[PDB]
Amino acid sequence: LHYVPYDTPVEDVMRILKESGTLVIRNFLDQNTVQKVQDEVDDYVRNWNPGPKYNTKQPSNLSLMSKTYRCEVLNHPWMHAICERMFGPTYGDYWFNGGSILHLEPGENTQPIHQDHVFYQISKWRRPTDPDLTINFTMALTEFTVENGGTRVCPGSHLWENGHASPAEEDMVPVLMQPGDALILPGSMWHSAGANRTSEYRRGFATSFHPCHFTPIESHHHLPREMVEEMTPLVQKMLGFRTLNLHNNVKVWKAGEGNLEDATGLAKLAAALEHHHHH
Amino acid sequence: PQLHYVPYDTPVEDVMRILKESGTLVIRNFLDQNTVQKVQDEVDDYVSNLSLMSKTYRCEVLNHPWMHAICERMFGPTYGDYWFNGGSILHLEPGENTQPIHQDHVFYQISKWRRPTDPDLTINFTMALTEFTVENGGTRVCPGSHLWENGHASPAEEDMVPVLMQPGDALILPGSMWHSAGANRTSEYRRGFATSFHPCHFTPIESHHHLPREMVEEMTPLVQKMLGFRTLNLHNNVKVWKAGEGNLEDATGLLAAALEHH
Numbered sequence: 001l002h003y004v005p006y007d008t009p010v011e012d013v014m015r016i017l018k019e020s021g022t023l024v025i026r027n028f029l030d031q032n033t034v035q036k037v038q039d040e041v042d043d044y045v046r047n048w049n050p051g052p053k054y055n056t057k058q059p060s061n062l063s064l065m066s067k068t069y070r071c072e073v074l075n076h077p078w079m080h081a082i083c084e085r086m087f088g089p090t091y092g093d094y095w096f097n098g099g100s101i102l103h104l105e106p107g108e109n110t111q112p113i114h115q116d117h118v119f120y121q122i123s124k125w126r127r128p129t130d131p132d133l134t135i136n137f138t139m140a141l142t143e144f145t146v147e148n149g150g151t152r153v154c155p156g157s158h159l160w161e162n163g164h165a166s167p168a169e170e171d172m173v174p175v176l177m178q179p180g181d182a183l184i185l186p187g188s189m190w191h192s193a194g195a196n197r198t199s200e201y202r203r204g205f206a207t208s209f210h211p212c213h214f215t216p217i218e219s220h221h222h223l224p225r226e227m228v229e230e231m232t233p234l235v236q237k238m239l240g241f242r243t244l245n246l247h248n249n250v251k252v253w254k255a256g257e258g259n260l261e262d263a264t265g266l267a268k269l270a271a272a273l274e275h276h277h278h279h
Numbered sequence: 280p281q282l283h284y285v286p287y288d289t290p291v292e293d294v295m296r297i298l299k300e301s302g303t304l305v306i307r308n309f310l311d312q313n314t315v316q317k318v319q320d321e322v323d324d325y326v327s328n329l330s331l332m333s334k335t336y337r338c339e340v341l342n343h344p345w346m347h348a349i350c351e352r353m354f355g356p357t358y359g360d361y362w363f364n365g366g367s368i369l370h371l372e373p374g375e376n377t378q379p380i381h382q383d384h385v386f387y388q389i390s391k392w393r394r395p396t397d398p399d400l401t402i403n404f405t406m407a408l409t410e411f412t413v414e415n416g417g418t419r420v421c422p423g424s425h426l427w428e429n430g431h432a433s434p435a436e437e438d439m440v441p442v443l444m445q446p447g448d449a450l451i452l453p454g455s456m457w458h459s460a461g462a463n464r465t466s467e468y469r470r471g472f473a474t475s476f477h478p479c480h481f482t483p484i485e486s487h488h489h490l491p492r493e494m495v496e497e498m499t500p501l502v503q504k505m506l507g508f509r510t511l512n513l514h515n516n517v518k519v520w521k522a523g524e525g526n527l528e529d530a531t532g533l534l535a536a537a538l539e540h541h
């Protein structure tokens with residue numbers, strides 16, 4: 001397991017991902033940003049917390065509940081640098097798969113050790129040298145420690161052949177992370193969260209991306225149009241509002257024979273040209 | 280293996296047996312003449328994107344019991360849910376030359392990983408609007424070529440078997456079946472149109488999120504799932520295409536037909 005600074009060259013990170021199958025990018029995000037995501041999620045769910053004396057929505061997509069998530073986190077250059085080099089040559093485009101809140105409650109037992117691509121039926125056609133089917137970025141809000149259940153990884157196990165037994169608990173390496181660090185988790189890396197034996201939640205959240213030709217865990221078609229229009233064009237494509245280009249330049253997710261973003265009406269020249277009557 | 284012409288009332292397991300053995304077949308009178316006429320008229324008034332252009336396509340054709348019976352047995356065991364992939368008008372003008380012989384699943388990067396004994400990546404239903412004759416460019420198939428290993432060379436032009444269809448007949452084209460349109464050496468256009476379906480875990484060629492809400496509410500729940508408006512269930516009870524943790528159709532506010540007090 002490698003812990004690398006934010007300014008590590010991209011080729012070195014992909015090199016380590018190839019060799020060991022995982023790594024941690026310290027200071028992946030500033031503590032400011034990860035805390036803002038948690039704050040915006042709290043403001044969305046609005047769970048009732050009783051005062052000391054007598055005197056709400058269910059959680060949805062992180063891109064819906066958190067403006068910071070859909071405007072800053074999903075534009076993270078480290079996410080797209082790794083995703084472009086991981087899926088690009090084989091699949092062309094990639095897009096957002098799913099993003100979860102990873103809050104470990106005090107007293108929760110150890111998580112089963114698993115690969116994230118296990119629910120892909122086609123993980124049985126893939127060989128360990130092929131590109132991964134998905135990649136997770138797990139960002140710490142609280143500290144990730146041994147006691148509070150920080151994620152454990154088994155380096156090298158991404159090259160294990162298909163059907164290889166799950167790794168042994170003794171050979172699971174805990175990931176120790178400060179707020180803002182991120183654990184890089186390809187879909188083939190064997191991992192699991194540990195037991196939280198402390199009196200406080202282990203907090204954090206994740207993004208994940210996978211090839212454009214695979215159906216994402218989450219749809220974002222229920223999001224209001226005002227949120228979709230404040231997204232960058234890159235994030236609009238990530239969240240399923242734009243046509244995708246395969247490796248062979250065949251298009252999927254099209255609106256008829258044209259692009260989806262054209263049929264839905266999803267400003268550029270007006271901002272650039274001062275003489276545009278909409279500037 | 281050979282090309283088979285079977286009637287509408289053929290039992291399903293025979294159709295699947297023929298599909299496994301020969302990789303293709305024709306179901307006669309797949310549509311009646313009314314549907315053949317109605318879809319032609321609706322497209323003309325609008326003039327792919329067939330669900331948007333033809334009310335008969337999205338309300339009746341996409342509910343076709345043969346499509347769902349075949350798709351259930353082809354994709355159900357391995358992937359669970361399936362949904363709409365793409366669909367286009369197949370219009371052949373006089374003088375058009377022969378189409379390159381191809382497999383439809385060729386554009387899936389994961390066709391390289393698949394074995395011929397695995398389930399198909401996609402299936403096409405090519406329905407004739409005009410007659411399909413050998414001289415007007417009727418589709419040609421190569422029965423048994425779906426079982427060739429990947430990277431196998433294309434069939435020779437002489438190994439291709441033309442398909443003959445009256446208006447309303449349908450050719451069933453798994454993604455592994457080598458096929459091509461012929462040259463239209465007649466004086467009248469050869470017309471058809473297609474539906475296609477593929478596993479729920481694969482991204483469709485065509486999105487339908489640009490369709491109007493009132494249009495989507497005309498659809499059946501089944502067709503709503505076909506066209507990307509409902510959460511999909513995998514073979515292993517895992518869900519994809521979900522809204523947060525709930526179903527997409529609940530989050531959009533998409534029983535009511537069964538109970539009159541609803």
Ligand SMILES: [Fe+2]
Pocket residue numbers: 114115116191
């Ligand atoms: Fe996981």
Ligand SMILES: [Fe+2]
Pocket residue numbers: 382383458
């Ligand atoms: Fe074709």
